[PDB]
Each structure stands twice: as C-alpha cells, then as structure tokens.
Design a binder for these strands. Sequence first.
RNA 1: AACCCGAUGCAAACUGCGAAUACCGGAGAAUGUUAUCACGGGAGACACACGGCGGGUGCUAACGUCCGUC
RNA 2: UCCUCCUAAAGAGUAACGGAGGAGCACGAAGGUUGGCUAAUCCUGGUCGGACAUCAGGAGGUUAGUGCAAUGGCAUAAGCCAGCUUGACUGCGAGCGUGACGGCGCGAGCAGGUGCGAAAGCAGGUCAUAGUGAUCCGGUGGUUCUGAAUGGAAGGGCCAUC
RNA 3: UGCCUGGCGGCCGUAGCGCGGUGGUCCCACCUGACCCCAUGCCGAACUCAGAAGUGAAACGCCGUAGCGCCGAUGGUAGUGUGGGGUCUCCCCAUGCGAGAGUAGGGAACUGCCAGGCA
Lengths: 76, 177, 116, 50
Amino acid sequence: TRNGRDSEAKRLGVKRFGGESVLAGSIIVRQRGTKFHAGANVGCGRDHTLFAKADGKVKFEVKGPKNRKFISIEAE
Amino acid sequence: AKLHDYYKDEVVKKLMTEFNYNSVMQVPRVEKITLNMGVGEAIADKKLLDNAAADLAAISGQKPLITKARKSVAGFKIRQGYPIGCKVTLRGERMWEFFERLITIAVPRIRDFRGLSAKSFDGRGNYSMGVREQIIFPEIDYDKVDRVRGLDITITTTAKSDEEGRALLAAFDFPFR
Amino acid sequence: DKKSARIRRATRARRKLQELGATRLVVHRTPRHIYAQVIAPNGSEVLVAASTVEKAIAEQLKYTGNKDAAAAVGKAVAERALEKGIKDVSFDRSGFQYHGRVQALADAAREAGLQF
Amino acid sequence: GIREKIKLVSSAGTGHFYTTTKNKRTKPEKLELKKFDPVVRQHVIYKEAK
RNA sequence: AACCCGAUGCAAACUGCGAAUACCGGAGAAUGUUAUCACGGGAGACACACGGCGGGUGCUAACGUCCGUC
RNA sequence: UCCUCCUAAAGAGUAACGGAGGAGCACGAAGGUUGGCUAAUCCUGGUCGGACAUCAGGAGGUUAGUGCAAUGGCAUAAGCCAGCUUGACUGCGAGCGUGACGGCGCGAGCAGGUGCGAAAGCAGGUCAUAGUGAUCCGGUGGUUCUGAAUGGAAGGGCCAUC
RNA sequence: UGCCUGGCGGCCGUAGCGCGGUGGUCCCACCUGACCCCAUGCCGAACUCAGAAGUGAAACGCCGUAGCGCCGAUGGUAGUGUGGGGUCUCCCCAUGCGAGAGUAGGGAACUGCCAGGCA
C-alpha cells in the first residue's frame, strides 16, 4: 500500500573464514542473530560481533549439547 | 502438633491394615493446605483488597499473599500484573492448627451442613472445594462483617489416586457426603 | 528437581571458569558429607580431592557434616594445596550460598593460606 | 518536543558539566547522581540539574 | 462466530533435510612478455541494445521496461 | 530521511511508481553486580465464575515473554522478582570492516577515581538495526591561549552546549 | 585384579522417551528439630543450620523390554558447471559432482581422572 521505500541492507554474515591467520582486533564474523558463538580466546561485542583476542588461526566447530556452532582460535 | 501426632500414631497402621502396603512411607501425606479468595470485584473499588488481606491474616496465623494477574485479558477489564485475588498457603504447625480448628468447630457449625462432595477431586489426589459465608469461622465477629465473601479450600495430597486420597482422609473420617 | 536446580545454578559458574582456563576449587555440600576438588587447567584432571568421608578427617569429628567438619576439610585441602604448590586457584560456589558450611570452608582455606 | 535538555553541574566549583534529555512532566523531582569529574579527580555529587 | 476435527489447494516473507555453481584463505608440479599491488600525470565515459542462463514487471501484445553473469 | 521480510539467482552488494509495512519515540530505571524464579495452550475439581478474573495436580517444554512495525536468536536464559547502584566514567586504544568521500560499526588492553560482588568476575548504556541534521552567523564557564606601541579591555580558537 | 556408589571431563538423541527388574555395607533423596547461620514479595514452599530414629514412597545408579524418537548404507530420483541438439514458457546427448524421505542394519550408549565401600 503506497510502498516504494526500501531500507539499506546492512551486510551481515561471516567475512573471515576458517584457516585464516588473523591478528588481534579482527572480526571473525558479524551475524545479526547468534548463528556462531564464541569459544576459547574469542570475544563477543554488544552487536553479536565475534573478534579474536589474540593472534592465531581461527576455526569453526559444532559444539554444545544444544547443537550450536562456536568459533575458536588456536596458536599458529 | 496434635494432628501430626495423630497422623503418625495410627493412620499408618490403619492404612496398612485396610490396603496392605509394603513400606511404612507408602502412606500418602498432604503437602499443603491453601485458602483462596478470587473475589474479582476489587476492580470496582480498591478498598476491598486491604480488608480481605486483614481478614485472611486474622483467620490464619500469618499474612496472606496477593496473586497478580497471570495474563492481560480484556474480558474482565484486568491488565497484566493486576492484584485481583489473594491466598494463604499453610504447611506444618500452622496448617495442623488451622485444620484442627476447622474440623473441631467450623465444619460442624456450617449452616445447612449435611456433607462434603467426594466427587470434587482433580483426578490426581488433591481435594478442592468451595464454601460461602466465610463468617462461619468463629474468628470473624458477625456484627463486624462488611460484605458477603466466599472461600476456596484446596488440600494438596501426594496420593496418586482418588481411592488413596479417600483412604488418607479416612483419618479425618470424611464426616459426611 | 533438587539436583537440576543446582546444575542450572552452577553451570554459569562452570562455564565462566572453564572459558578462562583457570584452575578452580569446586565444592559440593550435602547434609551428611561435603566434597572438595581442585580441577586442572585442562578441565579433565583433578589434582586434590578431599571429603569428610575420608577416615583421617572423620576420626576427629562428632557429626559427619557440620561447620567444624567443613572448616577441617577446608584446612586439609589448603594444606595439601600449599604442599603441592597449588597457590592462586580460583573458587566456584557450585550453586550454593556463602552463608553456611560452604562459606565456613572458604574462610578456613583463606586463613590456611589460599586466595580465591 | 515532550523532552527537554537538562544540564548537570557538579556541586563543587568545577565548571565541567554534563548534559542529558529528560521530561519534568512525570518526574518533577530533581536529579541526584554522582559521576567522576576530571578537574577534581574524584566522584562528586551533582545537583542543580534544572 | 472463535478453537478444534475430516479434508482441500499454495508458498516470497517455514526449513526437524539439502545440493550442483560461485567467493574466500594455507601447501603444491605445471604455464602466462609480472599477466599482481603501490605512487605521480593525462584521459574518455558516467544515455547502452540483442541472444543464452533464473526472474520481476504487462493481459508474453511486442524489437515494451528493469535485474546477477558470458 | 531512515528501518524490517521476499523479490534479489546459497561470499557481500544488487534496480523497477513490486508485494506488506513501521520510525521523529522513551528508561537516570525498563542498564550492571549477587541471589532466586522460569512461558503460551490443553485436561482434571470447585461459591458468585461463564470459553478465559484466582486456587491445586497433570500434559506441554518455549510457538509465551523478550516496550514499539519487522528480523534472527535469548534455558548459562538477553524473560520475571529482591539490596545497592551511576562504568548513561575520565584521556587513550594496536587492530578489523564498510562505503569514492564527509561519515559509520566493533574492539582486547593501558593510567586514574570507581559501582556491584567475600573473591573469581561484569559494568565506556538499553539483545542488536530506524527516534536522524552539517556548513556560515550568534548564546552560556572557564582557558590572562592569542591580544595591531605597553597596561588592559575589545576581538578570535579548544572543550560541554542551543 | 575385579563389582558397587559419589564427584569432575570428551559427543549430545546408535547418547534419547515409555514399561518391568534390581539396590542401601561406601555415598544421595526424604524421613527429626530449628527460639539459633540463613530467608520467605505468607509459608523451613525454596535455601541454610543442628541431628541420624526408617527405608528406597519419590528421585537416582545398572540390566532387560526394539513399544515411540534417531542415525544409517548401496543405488534410484530431482538437479547442476561445460559444449552441442531438439518440437525451446521446457527437454535430450557425453562428461565431474550430487538430493531428501524411505529400504537392509543398529541401538537401552561409549569413554578419561579422583574419593569411599565390598572381595
């Protein structure tokens, strides 16, 4: 009804994938809902943004009794 | 204390004799006894909840609890969290004293009292009924009555069946039906 | 359920201690006996374990579970930790309250020389 | 509109002050809060919020 | 006249399942005039049309109109 | 002017007078600590009470709620209750991404005063996207920073702010 | 060197849901009291403190029950990148890859460290 106004599509999703050598402060993935959670040596911001707390190689793995997917980082 | 001792003394023995249980703990026991006032008329005027709470506190050995509305429904003009009804839950010495007073004086003196309703079972073991003119309780002075109010009695029984509930109440003898 | 409530009230603490990878002391208090354990950084090995069930602590007490028994077991675990070099180990409440035998054991260990 | 801006000045002589948005229509009472003031190097009670 | 039952059809605002493409990072034999990136000067352009591939739009009526790629 | 879902072809982005829409708000508590609790709906029994005002048990196991229109997620509950609360801090922030650009989002940690919690630990706002608006000229407190010979004043710049 | 019980971990359904059996010597539930540590938006309901008289009501450890949920091949089937062809709003040829559900089959989980009791 009298439409014709489309909002800007904010870009979400994973932008840095597994097996990526990422330094501290990088953002592994930006998902609106918590599709991917944090694991060891990984931090989460207010806007569900996952970042690496130290340099290393990132990886994704299914974890948790509820069948959730976590993102972790290991020494490279 | 009196009712607790009475329950511990011979209720277990009679239940074993008339049912042939296995363990001494097979005897069902009532977890709690709750009185409820769902007046629902407090919406018209707010100076009824305080009177109901005072009456409940006087009747029982402790102050009551005001139960907020579960859901916001427009059919009764009640919003979410509305304190419409009140209750008093008793367990232990207070419950024993209240039940003793009830059975001793209140139940025999009920106007046009012939017997309770055995069919009033929730199908699990608890015993729930309702009584009008709570003034039947001797605590409330007749001349001090302000409005005619009801009461709902619910005794939670761990018994899994109505027959087990009746067997447990046999200690109270279930005066009449 | 009695155990389900404790599990759901202590899972947050377990997660918080595990994600940090810091050794923690976990205490489970029961009316009869109380158990204390120190978990390794990996989270799969226990370095020190103690409880009132042990005869060495049960032979000098009147009742199995009480404030005195909690203090005794706390002192024993603190002494063993000091002997083994297990200083600077965090603590987890395991969903209990810091107002009874749990806090008595915590204070006993703190006096014995453990920080947490 | 309904809201109006209110300044928040430290009770002390420090000139540094904060600003916020509030409406006095439902909250005529004044503001009682403490915040760190760089000039004094310590938390100071704020008043005269207007 | 709500919910519900016996069905009836559908899915762009459904996925307890789920590809084939395509994009991305680490190792590597082979090959391309470094075909890759950075800096400075100068441009042009900033009106496109058709076929294929999956479509919106109109009543496939069209050599109507707009989308992602060769 | 901005925000949500499909169109929009499984990185991201992606137009059309296409299909449905909403936002110009608000909380100094509706945010944080510690502790405790865990919905809609259905069946069973009952005094006003009936399809639902409240009470007790069972099934249900998050479809309830998560302020707004919409989105994914929230059980470790981000949902509800109780004590304190101002971290709705100060100056920094390597780095990461987005757009041609102004601009925009995240961010561990650094020195200080700190709130909560016995400690471990959280707190640089609201589970997150819309509630937005510059340039020029002028208002408020200081900054003797500058000051058309000097003392000054007048005038000009930083900050918080119309 | 074995069996049982309790605590902390690797995965969350071959790990589960329903029914029966089994167990109090080590440990746990309740069972005793709480004017006291602690607290109820009332209640020792929840939580906590002091005690141990009974017994597995209920919960819980383990085995059977294949009654329900799940996974699970082999291929078939729908499709798809490439070049070509056809009767082209849709299909076929050669090639790389490849569905879901269902089918044979499984299942009462497996496994690492510490404490106590019974041999």
